[PDB]
Design a protein around this nucleic acid. Structure first.
Ligand code: NA
Length: 206
DNA sequence: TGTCCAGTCT
DNA sequence: AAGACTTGGAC
């Protein structure tokens, strides 16, 4: 892709990381899903390591409508106890219900509608919902709406990516990631994907 | 027969 | 706002 080509040519560390990792093969498993579904997966993935986040999300998608993902109506109506059994905190359950209501109301738009809005508009609009921050919308931008120039600086694994990439002693700050990732445009979504891959390199040190 | 730590609101 | 909040892997 043009993204790997651009990223290889940045500096020595990048050219090297991109060769270590290989071709840009993004996970597109969410690209045909409705925004509320990806938003919920992002909520599940807040804070925890991926194995925990997936265990929680997989239990949730498994409690519904002929194997199908729970509809917004179902979620709004759903007993709190069974969402607590999935592993969602009290705060996160509330967020889930807010998401259900915002989807029913149209504050959270359909896929077709969301695709017309700018990154900036989605962030401002969606972070009105309690439980949804910038990072959460950025996951939506990346995993569901095919936005190619998104760097989630607040992401713990993105920062550990730069700790790796730049052979840093300690783990860098949001602002540091903000400063250094500018060179990655207009492909900072691919940059992020490479960064997220650092943790699985034989080279990786915790 | 346990501890710690891997976004968000307040 | 300094800390509570959830489950699971690494020990
Ligand atoms: Na918010």
């Amino acid at each position: 892709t043009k993204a790997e080509i651009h990223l290889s040519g940045l500096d020595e560390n990048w050219k090297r990381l991109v060769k270590l990792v290989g071709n840009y093969r993004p996970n597109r498993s969410m690209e045909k899903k409705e925004p509320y579904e990806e938003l919920i997966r992002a909520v599940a993935s807040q804070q925890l390591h991926s194995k925990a986040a997936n265990a929680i999300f997989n239990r949730f998608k498994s409690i519904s409508n002929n194997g199908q993902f729970p509809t917004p109506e179902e979620i709004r109506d759903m007993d709190f106890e069974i969402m607590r059994a999935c592993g969602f905190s009290a705060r996160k359950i509330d967020s889930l219900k807010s998401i259900a209501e915002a989807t029913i109301s149209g504050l959270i738009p359909t896929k077709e509608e969301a695709e017309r809005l700018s990154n900036e508009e989605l962030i401002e609009r969606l972070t009105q919902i309690k439980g949804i921050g910038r990072w959460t919308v950025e996951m939506l931008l990346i995993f569901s709406l095919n936005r190619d120039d998104v760097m989630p600086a607040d992401d713990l694994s993105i920062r550990n990516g730069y700790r790796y990439l730049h052979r840093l002693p300690k783990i860098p700050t949001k602002m540091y990631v903000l400063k250094h990732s500018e060179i990655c445009a207009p492909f900072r979504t691919a940059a992020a994907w490479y960064l997220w891959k650092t943790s699985k390199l034989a080279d990786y040190t915790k």
